Amino acid sequence: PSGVEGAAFQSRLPHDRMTSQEAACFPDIISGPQQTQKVFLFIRNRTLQLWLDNPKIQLTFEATLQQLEAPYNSDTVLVHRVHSYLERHGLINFGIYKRIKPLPTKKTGKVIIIGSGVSGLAAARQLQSFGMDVTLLEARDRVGGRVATFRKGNYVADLGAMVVTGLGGNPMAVVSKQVNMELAKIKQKCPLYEANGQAVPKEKDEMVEQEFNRLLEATSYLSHQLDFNVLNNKPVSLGQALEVVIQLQEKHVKDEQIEHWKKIVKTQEELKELLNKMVNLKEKIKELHQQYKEASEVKPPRDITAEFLVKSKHRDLTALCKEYDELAETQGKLEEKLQELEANPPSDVYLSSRDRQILDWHFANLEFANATPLSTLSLKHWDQDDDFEFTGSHLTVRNGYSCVPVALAEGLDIKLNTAVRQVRYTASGCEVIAVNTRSTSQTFIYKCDAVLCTLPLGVLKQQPPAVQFVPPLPEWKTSAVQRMGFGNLNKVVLCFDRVFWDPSVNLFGHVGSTTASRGELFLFWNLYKAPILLALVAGEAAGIMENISDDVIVGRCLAILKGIFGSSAVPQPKETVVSRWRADPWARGSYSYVAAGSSGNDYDLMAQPITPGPSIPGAPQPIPRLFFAGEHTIRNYPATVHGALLSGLREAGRIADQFLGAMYTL
Amino acid sequence: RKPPKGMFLSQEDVEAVSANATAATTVLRQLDMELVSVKRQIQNIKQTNSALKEKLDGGIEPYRLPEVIQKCNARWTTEEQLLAVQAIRKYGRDFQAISDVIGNKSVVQVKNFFVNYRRRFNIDEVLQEWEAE
Numbered sequence: 015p016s017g018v019e020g021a022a023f024q025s026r027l028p029h030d031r032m033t034s035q036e037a038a039c040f041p042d043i044i045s046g047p048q049q050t051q052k053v054f055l056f057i058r059n060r061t062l063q064l065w066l067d068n069p070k071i072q073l074t075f076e077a078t079l080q081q082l083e084a085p086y087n088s089d090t091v092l093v094h095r096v097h098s099y100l101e102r103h104g105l106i107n108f109g110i111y112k113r114i115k116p117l118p119t120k121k122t123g124k125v126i127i128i129g130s131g132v133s134g135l136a137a138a139r140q141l142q143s144f145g146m147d148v149t150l151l152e153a154r155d156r157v158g159g160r161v162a163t164f165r166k167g168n169y170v171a172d173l174g175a176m177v178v179t180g181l182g183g184n185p186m187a188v189v190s191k192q193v194n195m196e197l198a199k200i201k202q203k204c205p206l207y208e209a210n211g212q213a214v215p216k217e218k219d220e221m222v223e224q225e226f227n228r229l230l231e232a233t234s235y236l237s238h239q240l241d242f243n244v245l246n247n248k249p250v251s252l253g254q255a256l257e258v259v260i261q262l263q264e265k266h267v268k269d270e271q272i273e274h275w276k277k278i279v280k281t282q283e284e285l286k287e288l289l290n291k292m293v294n295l296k297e298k299i300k301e302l303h304q305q306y307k308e309a310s311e312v313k314p315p316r317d318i319t320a321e322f323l324v325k326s327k328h329r330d331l332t333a334l335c336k337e338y339d340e341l342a343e344t345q346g347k348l349e350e351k352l353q354e355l356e357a358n359p360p361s362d363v364y365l366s367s368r369d370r371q372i373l374d375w376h377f378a379n380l381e382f383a384n385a386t387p388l389s390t391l392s393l394k395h396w397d398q399d400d401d402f403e404f405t406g407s408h409l410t411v412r413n414g415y416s417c418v419p420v421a422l423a424e425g426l427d428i429k430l431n432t433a434v435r436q437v438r439y440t441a442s443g444c445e446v447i448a449v450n451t452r453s454t455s456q457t458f459i460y461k462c463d464a465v466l467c468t469l470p471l472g473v474l475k476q477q478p479p480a481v482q483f484v485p486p487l488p489e490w491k492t493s494a495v496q497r498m499g500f501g502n503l504n505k506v507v508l509c510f511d512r513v514f515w516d517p518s519v520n521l522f523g524h525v526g527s528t529t530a531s532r533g534e535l536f537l538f539w540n541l542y543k544a545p546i547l548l549a550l551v552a553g554e555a556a557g558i559m560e561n562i563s564d565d566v567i568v569g570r571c572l573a574i575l576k577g578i579f580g581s582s583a584v585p586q587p588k589e590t591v592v593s594r595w596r597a598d599p600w601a602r603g604s605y606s607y608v609a610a611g612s613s614g615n616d617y618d619l620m621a622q623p624i625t626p627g628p629s630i631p632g633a634p635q636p637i638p639r640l641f642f643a644g645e646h647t648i649r650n651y652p653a654t655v656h657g658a659l660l661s662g663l664r665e666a667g668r669i670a671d672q673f674l675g676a677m678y679t680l
Numbered sequence: 681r682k683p684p685k686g687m688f689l690s691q692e693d694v695e696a697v698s699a700n701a702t703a704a705t706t707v708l709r710q711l712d713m714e715l716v717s718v719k720r721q722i723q724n725i726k727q728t729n730s731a732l733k734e735k736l737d738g739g740i741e742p743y744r745l746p747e748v749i750q751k752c753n754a755r756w757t758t759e760e761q762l763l764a765v766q767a768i769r770k771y772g773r774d775f776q777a778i779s780d781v782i783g784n785k786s787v788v789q790v791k792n793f794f795v796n797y798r799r800r801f802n803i804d805e806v807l808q809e810w811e812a813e
Contacts, residue, residue, distance in 0.1 A: 228684045228686070228687060229687075231684045231687075232683060232684060232687045232689060235682075235683045235684075235687075235689060236689065236694070239681065239682075240689070240691055240694065242694060245698055257704075258694060258697055258698065258704075259687070259689065261697050261704045261708065262688055262689055262693055262694070262697060263687065263688065264708060265688075265693065265697070265707065265708060265711065266688040268708065268711035268712065268715060269711065271715055272711060272714060272715055272718065275715065275718045275719060275722060276718060278722055279718060279721055279722055279725065282722060282725045282726060282729065283725060285729055286725055286728060286729050286732070289729055289732035289733065289736070290732065292732075292736055293732055293735050293736065296735075296736060296739075296740055296743075299740050299743045300743060302743075303742075303743040306745070318759060318762040318763065318766070319766065321759070321763070322762075322763055322766040322767070322781070325763060325781045325782075325783070326766075326767075326770065326781060328745060328748075329777055329780045329781050331743070331745060332745060332747075332780075333777070335740055335743070335744055335745075338739075338740050342739070
């Protein structure tokens with residue numbers, strides 16, 4: 015898209031109608047005449063454009079109004095309202111801009127932010143620019159959270175997020191202009207190599223992939239048009255539904271063979287019945303010939319009955335000889351109809367044991383995409399975010415994704431090596447209790463108006479609790495934490511001193527011997543300047559490989575690479591790193607997934623802030639005190655870095671509206 | 681609205697594979713066993729029809745008679761009349777067979793012949809006698 019209409023698209027907003035969010039801030043506009051609605055929408059879309067076309071400087075309200083043409087710049091208060099809504103909710107003036115108007119000398123309100131991952135950092139940075147006192151508590155010795163970059167010498171490799179999924183409507187696009195990210199595209203081409211070490215031939219690769227895509231499309235049919243979403247009082251997973259769909263294909267192949275050979279027997283029997291007339295007729299002909307000979311033997315002159323007998327038997331014999339010919343026409347019509355059907359039998363198998371291995375690799379992709387075995391994904395809901403995907407190529411970050419959190423951390427109060435241990439929220443405020451990760455006896459108490467929790471879903475899931483809430487989180491929240499899925503996905507970084515792979519290929523697959531090991535080192539990434547290959551561990555393999563030492567793992571990696579490239583082209587690696595994210599106590603997994611029995615509605619439950627009970631009974635109902643952000647809290651963009659970031663922007667707007675007031679609603 | 685082409689997915693089949701834990705591998709096994717049943721029933725009727733074919737070697741070539749190319753005629757010689765009455769006695773009303781016996785009479789004057797000699801040759805009685813057999 016293009017123009018002001020393109021700014022709305024790049025801000026994930028409809029250009030020609032008003033969202034639920036802005037109906038709430040502008041209930042006068044939306045309930046009023048469409049002429050003002052179109053004015054409003056134009057003011058919104060234009061202001062977004064201004065910010066988007068240059069996001070390295072703050073977009074002040076005045077700069078906005080100066081560049082607004084009439085009649086749109088007539089209502090000066092509407093323009094100030096729109097600009098203030100966009101600024102508050104992080105649609106403009108978010109990230110790392112130079113600020114025209116420097117910060118107010120003295121702050122208002124005090125917020126404690128648990129975690130300095132991207133969601134935390136994005137909120138912290140907004141809150142501070144709104145005039146609040148913000149402190150982040152971070153368990154690790156570095157910022158970024160699940161954005162984690164390895165750096166040694168000139169080796170650089172991401173252990174966490176690696177790709178930016180498109181810039182069409184993606185908030186990272188704005189960040190990539192503010193921070194120096196070396197964004198390099200990913201060429202979709204992915205050569206596969208079976209366990210032996212030899213490339214899967216192109217004819218196979220296209221057919222299995224298209225079956226994979228058809229199998230998926232087929233489960234959607236089971237889900238929607240057949241409503242196959244509960245089986246034995248339990249929710250159906252994607253994985254179950256795939257087995258059901260594969261079985262029914264195997265079944266139809268047998269159904270198809272049975273009726274084919276049943277057409278063979280139906281006509282072999284029709285032949286048998288024909289050959290039976292022909293034996294019996296050729297015996298009748300044999301006898302009747304004999305009788306014609308004997309009758310013919312009586313020599314003339316004959317009386318007329320003896321003459322009749324010759325003429326008679328002759329008529330009778332040619333009649334029977336005519337039947338036996340009509341029945342050898344028919345015998346040929348069928349001896350061909352048979353050899354025809356023998357010539358064209360149907361498919362012998364649905365998929366060979368070689369095919370279902372290559373199909374298993376395409377399932378390892380899907381298991382990688384959702385960081386979980388397909389047996390845990392909700393059949394109905396696992397792809398509920400597909401409608402909000404961004405447009406464009408997927409990219410990687412050549413200088414390491416960490417440049418982004420590190421950049422956002424500039425100018426913020428971050429206490430590292432500070433493990434939050436307990437969160438107390440009351441009608442009058444909050445106190446957060448943390449310890450030092452190096453010596454746990456050293457204890458800290460932080461007092462604040464509000465806590466913004468960005469603890470990973472895996473941490474919130476931990477029993478017994480790594481973090482205690484006082485009072486406990488309500489059942490509606492903890493149940494959402496149970497129902498949701500927090501998956502797992504690991505990486506092996508292989509640092510060589512020579513590039514020996516095809517450098518025109520960003521990524522290539524390895525097909526697994528077994529179904530159960532389909533995720534074990536199934537995919538390799540060539541993303542970086544230096545000679546670094548990156549190897550994925552997905553599905554059920556991920557959780558298993560964490561209990562295997564690094565040397566065994568890098569070993570299995572070397573064997574696979576030698577199989578493809580030859581035992582002589584693959585040197586020992588200089589440096590090796592193996593992630594274990596489920597083992598990491600500040601992650602306990604990689605990212606969330608729509609578990610069977612869950613839905614995207616749970617992502618909304620996770621984002622709902624907590625309001626404590628009154629300290630004095632009969633006192634008026636209080637303000638909300640505990641807020642939640644993070645990738646597990648944003649329904650339309652879960653499990654991504656852009657999704658985390660957006661959730662931080664969201665809570666910062668929500669918290670500011672609470673503690674500073676929203677003056678844009680009159 | 682419909683399953684992708686070449687996918688087969690009917691509601692009745694899905695219940696049949698979801699009924700228990702192994703309802704998949706039984707339903708498949710029954711068809712696998714039912715197929716080998718049919719494959720060897722082929723081997724059997726194909727073996728039977730191999731024997732029947734052996735019996736027909738030679739066909740009926742030795743038992744064939746030369747075709748009597750013979751111009752028609754409309755004059756009923758006495759012998760031909762007597763052939764006719766006997767053909768009526770053994771063939772009922774099958775005018776093609778009767779014309780084929782006499783040879784030089786076509787199917788129509790055979791038809792005509794029954795009315796022409798109906799009384800003189802008791803052609804009624806001859807058919808009544810033929811009816812009894």
